[PDB]
């Protein structure tokens, strides 16, 4: 029995520092949906664990030239963590190098605007130039646009990849701040889960517009062939069927909502 | 050894698999059409196998008998070696995952309520608090098991009612449940997956609707026998087809493009 090293990422409301974190130690420093989920998964699988925050603050992408993975995916691939418990999107390129559990949450790519921005859809963004728009770096949303051969999305990528100044951001928090401070001239493409959370937080000045652009899931990731993968997968299904995943979503999204 | 034709188990459930109007003068896989027929062709293409569609003999999804411990339905066909793969609206569940493998999901769904239009019901809570309107589920499937196992008060109350209701509120097929809603003048509501509910909502005579939120959140997966050689490739194919947009295209094709209610 060794202590399982969990890689995760500071991303609200999945993993956040507690208000009084500087007087706390180890796993107790953190709170959120994924902190609660990690505790449940560990209990059902019978392991002790240490939450670590991913060194480079990234989800994970492969460098096209060196072929080296960064982010949480890299931490699994290179043996620096035993499991990733985070809002980590299940994707084909990742499933080729790590294992994922069945999904614990559904999501799709979505559009965040400052309230009153005259945009209702992806189509709307693609047909104009007044309002800039971008995505997170080193994540699945950027890759979605990079690979899409859907007319509207391909046009969006052509604009985004060459836009000056850069429309990409290092963290979700940076993307949201950019929307909030840009007086309606920046829209942000991000996962519906994070969009819907921010929509219910003060100062209540953003909103999700239009339908989701795709439909996918987050999964708990382990290194290819790991001894933990089987148990973790069954634990996710058990938590789903018990209603625990629904309980946690309600706890962290809507019970804590502050826009009424 | 040499490549063998893959036996695919599936179920006659609209719009996933249906008999073509002219099926008697067609052969083999060409007899059938639907979302799962289109998906099977794509999975087969991408994984590089030839296949034969077969309809599950007992017309069931899959449950384990309490007494005999024998699995029926498509799950049983995989467990007992009669089929190599199931391509169907088969729900990923823990009890099934213990005996077969599932791909990552190809379609999201949740348990939902179907009413005859005008029935004074807006929620599961509403059903649970009243007695004039009967309600039930497919008699062997993941929806029945959901209610059987739920520790949530509203759903426990519903199960306590359904399990003891006479005459039986359970049905043998989705089609039977839908017909029961339609003929019962608002006095029967049917608990079924959102996917099937939304499909029927777009079918003549346009007299049913889905009401309230979904009761749970889950998915359908492509299933293979435990440790099958096909599992890895099938899973990658699902993710590829998801990412390209094929799954969205197929849902629109079979649900909404051919909808009969505007
Ligand atoms: O809320 C929850 C918790 C338990 C599962 N659940 C609902 C759910 C259902 C399906 C998905 N997923 N997950 C994926 C994928 F694996 F990421 F590709 C795909 C879908 C649907 C479309 O096909 C791709 C994701 C979530
Ligand atoms: N969940 C994403 C990060 C957020 C995004 O790309 O929008 C990932 O796993 O890469
Ligand atoms: N998809 C379900 C059948 C339909 C239902 O139970 O509502 C299953 O796999 O058992
Ligand atoms: Zn638990
Ligand atoms: Zn580089
Ligand atoms: Zn194809």
UniProtKB/Swiss-Prot annotation, chain B:
Residues annotated as glycosylated: 3
Induction behaviour: Down-regulated in the pyramidal cell layer of CA1 in the hippocampus by global ischemia.
Phylogenetic lineage: Eukaryota, Metazoa, Chordata, Craniata, Vertebrata
Subcellular location per the Swiss-Prot or TrEMBL entry: Cell membrane; Postsynaptic cell membrane; Postsynaptic density membrane
Name by which UniProt lists this protein: Glutamate receptor 2
Record-annotated site: Crucial to convey clamshell closure to channel opening: 121
Record's comment on post-translational modification: Palmitoylated. Depalmitoylated upon L-glutamate stimulation.
Residues of the full protein shown: 413 to 795 of 883
Subunit and interaction comment: Homotetramer or heterotetramer of pore-forming glutamate receptor subunits. Tetramers may be formed by the dimerization of dimers. May interact with MPP4. Forms a ternary complex with GRIP1 and CSPG4. Interacts with ATAD1 in an ATP-dependent manner. ATAD1-catalyzed ATP hydrolysis disrupts binding to ATAD1 and to GRIP1 and leads to AMPAR complex disassembly. Interacts with GRIP2. Interacts with GRIP1. Interacts with NSF via its C-terminus. Interacts with CACNG2, PICK1 and GRIP2. Interacts with GRIA1 and SYNDIG1. Part of a complex containing GRIA2, NSF and NAPA and/or NAPB.
Organism (species): Rattus norvegicus (Rat)
Family, per entry: Belongs to the glutamate-gated ion channel (TC 1.A.10.1) family. GRIA2 subfamily.
Site (described: Interaction with the cone snail toxin Con-ikot-ikot): 64, 148, 240
Residue(s) carrying Phosphoserine: 150, 184
Binding of L-glutamate, residues: 89, 91, 96, 142-143, 193
Topological domains annotated Extracellular: 120-262
Domain commentary: The M4 transmembrane segment mediates tetramerization and is required for cell surface expression.
Note: The postsynaptic actions of L-glutamate are mediated by a variety of receptors that are named according to their selective agonists. This receptor binds AMPA (quisqualate) > L-glutamate > kainate.
